[PDB]
Design a protein around this nucleic acid. Structure first.
Lengths: 176, 177
DNA sequence: AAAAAGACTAATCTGTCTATCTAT
DNA sequence: ATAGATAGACAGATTAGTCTTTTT
């Protein structure tokens, strides 16, 4: 009748792991219901439809990636512009350089869910946020021409089935 | 027990136009058959299953992307490395600016079919082919640290819901160094 | 015989939604 | 009565193998 946030946040986390491992298509409600040690009726007292459940899962993953990159950049010196560059590269690395990587969860949401314009907007607002939060740290050094190439090159790393990825020493030569 | 190859390409091209705008899991084979104005049994005589049809659809797209890039870089002036880099850049922007872009058809096949290992191999074979055919025309080594950044910046243009696309003058200033 | 159109079916699998059934 | 499990059940679609009729 009123799903507890202990249980409510369990269908979200269980589905997010099932979605990142596989896909939005393969993983069904019945798959998440059993693995989250929950029933089917109580799942609908907090989420009306599956499309609302996918949007809810996307906002949680976007906020997760937001805090993940926010803390990683704040651990370097304000004048150490090279440490911010390496943290930005290693952040895109530990995502793509993982076992069973088939793209980020945000890229999957834009491919399967072109029907809802709010989903592509939610991902676009984060990609713009990732660029602007990275330029906030390095605004007095790297110019906008090189910044757009740095971020676009880092986005090419997140692209699955990509070859000839730019190493850190390759990124080191761009700064100087 | 055999099918006309003219009809074979009609089922293949109809599904490709359906997948590039809607993805693989949205379009069913009953929709592909009804959209191609063909019969349901003629689809199974040529293609044994649905995954065999998808892999055949991926091989046709890669060979299409191969000739499209081989020609665009080939029609450029000989030893005009700047004009080739400009055509290589405008090629990725032309793909990302196509209406209804939710990702490359290769990216969808990789994401939506993680189970089939040969799908991830064919796209990896294409991206490996794309980087090496670019170093050939530029008279540059296959290990140029600049080249690895240029191509990866172009793939970032093909990212779904991308933003802050680098301008041509940005890619020009890199190669100018 | 060859190909090509036409539904059958069947075995399957979901999306919600009903109908209780408790323990609390 | 709240909360949460535990089921089938309506309603669609669905992929693959069957059967019929037909034109070349």
């Amino acid at each position: 009748f009123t799903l507890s946030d202990e249980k409510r946040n369990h269908i979200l986390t269980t589905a997010l792991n099932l979605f990142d491992q596989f896909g939005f298509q393969h993983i069904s409600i019945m798959r998440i219901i059993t693995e989250a040690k929950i029933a089917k009726q109580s799942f609908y007292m907090a989420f009306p439809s599956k499309d609302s459940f996918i949007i809810e899962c996307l906002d949680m993953e976007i906020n997760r990636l937001k805090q993940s990159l926010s803390n990683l950049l704040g651990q370097c010196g304000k004048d150490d512009h090279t440490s911010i560059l390496k943290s930005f590269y290693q952040w895109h690395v530990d995502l793509a350089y993982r076992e069973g990587y088939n793209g980020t969860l945000l890229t999957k949401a834009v491919i399967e869910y072109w029907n809802l314009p709010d989903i592509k907007m939610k991902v676009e607002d984060f990609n713009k946020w990732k660029y602007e939060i990275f330029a906030e740290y390095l605004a007095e050094e790297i110019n906008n021409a090189r910044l757009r190439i740095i971020v676009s090159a880092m986005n090419g790393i997140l692209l699955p089935a990509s070859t000839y990825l730019p190493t850190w020493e390759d990124i080191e030569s761009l700064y100087g």
